């Protein structure tokens, strides 16, 4: 368990959680953001955005890298005060209504996390053999070892069955293996 | 409201069989030699330093260079890659040490293995939607549904529940039905 380097307080939570933020994740975020040395609102998405919250994308260096570390794990409903040291914030020379050096104190609220799936990186992750197609092998040997990732054990039954259910609804045009196409474009109709 | 600057990639080798890409998380032992684009000149060789020892590197969290994580991606073991990074990629306006402020860098990376990287915190609460500090089957499952989804498989309950079965045949010790902290911590595998 590492040090944090910013200071995460979980303000509120949800009656339920059903899923929590993890990198990638676009989350849908009210905020408020305040200098920790005189407490002036430096910026409201309420106040200076015509009351619209906005969207982020966590855990890629899109903003602060306090965000990044401050903003995982967390559930729609729930709202969370982060108080980021400079060096993690804008640091020296610092931008707009921001000083130099300051230590920043945001209050921010998710509304609504997003991911996209299918990103053309995972087709290419699977694609061993890089012919643009996915076979049942191609797809037995991810599962295996993205469970063993995780220190989670095979049963080559139970996965030998999830490959030919995953082939039988993929596998539109029935020639054994997931084109491109047939990976990106999804229709249950 | 921001751009962005890459890396150019030259694959300078490729195995007869890739038998798994490189994703994030993962663990990567490589060979490397550094240069300065701007003279060509090496800046370090890990066949020269700590008598010939490849490096391990872990792939996506920022371990080291951004221009890193943007170039070594979807890597087979075998394969090699020459990595061209810019400035803001590399060790940036600032410079480090014997780099140069603003220095273009060439590195030329080779893959002679895949690990898994080990079990996080970060990986442990995300999972633990309710935060009671075990893993409920429910949340693994939930957790199972979105990785499926993420990379292209949406299957049916039994597939989840048996794979969750699976999974806490082996984690689950007292068999109170969760996997504590406790429990996660170790792949006892
Ligand atoms: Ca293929
Ligand atoms: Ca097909
Ligand atoms: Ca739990
Ligand atoms: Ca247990
Ligand atoms: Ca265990």
Request: glycine letters at 8%; charged letters at 35%.
């Given at each position: 368990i590492?040090?944090?380097?910013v ?8 009656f ?5 933020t993890?990198?990638?994740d ?6 408020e953001?305040y ?6 609102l430096?910026?409201?998405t309420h106040?200076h ?5 906005i969207?982020?994308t966590?855990g890629?260096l899109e903003?602060?890298?306090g ?7 967390m ?8 108080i980021i ?9 610092g931008?707009?209504?921001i000083p130099?050096?300051?230590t920043?104190?945001?209050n921010?609220?998710?509304?609504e996390?997003?991911?996209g799936?299918?990103s053309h990186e995972?087709?290419q992750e699977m694609?061993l053999n890089?012919?643009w ?5 191609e797809?037995?040997?991810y599962?295996?070892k ?6 989670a054990?095979?049963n080559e039954?139970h996965?030998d069955?999830?490959?030919?259910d ?9 020639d054994?293996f997931?084109?491109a ?5 999804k229709?249950?109709?």
């Amino acid at each position: 368990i590492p040090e944090p380097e910013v200071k995460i307080e979980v303000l509120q939570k949800p009656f339920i959680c059903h899923r929590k933020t993890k990198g990638g994740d676009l989350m849908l975020v009210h905020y408020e953001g305040y200098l920790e040395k005189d407490g002036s609102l430096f910026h409201s998405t309420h106040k200076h955005n015509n009351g619209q919250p906005i969207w982020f994308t966590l855990g890629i260096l899109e903003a602060l890298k306090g965000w990044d570390q401050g903003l995982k794990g967390m559930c729609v409903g729930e709202k969370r005060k982060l108080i980021i040291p400079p060096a993690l914030g804008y640091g020296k020379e610092g931008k707009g209504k921001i000083p130099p050096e300051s230590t920043l104190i945001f209050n921010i609220d998710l509304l609504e996390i997003r991911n996209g799936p299918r990103s053309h990186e995972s087709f290419q992750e699977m694609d061993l053999n890089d012919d643009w197609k996915l076979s049942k092998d191609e797809v037995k040997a991810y599962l295996k070892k993205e469970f063993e990732k995780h220190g989670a054990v095979v049963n080559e039954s139970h996965h030998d069955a999830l490959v030919e259910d995953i082939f039988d609804k993929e596998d539109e045009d029935k020639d054994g293996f997931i084109s491109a196409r047939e990976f990106t474009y999804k229709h249950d109709e």
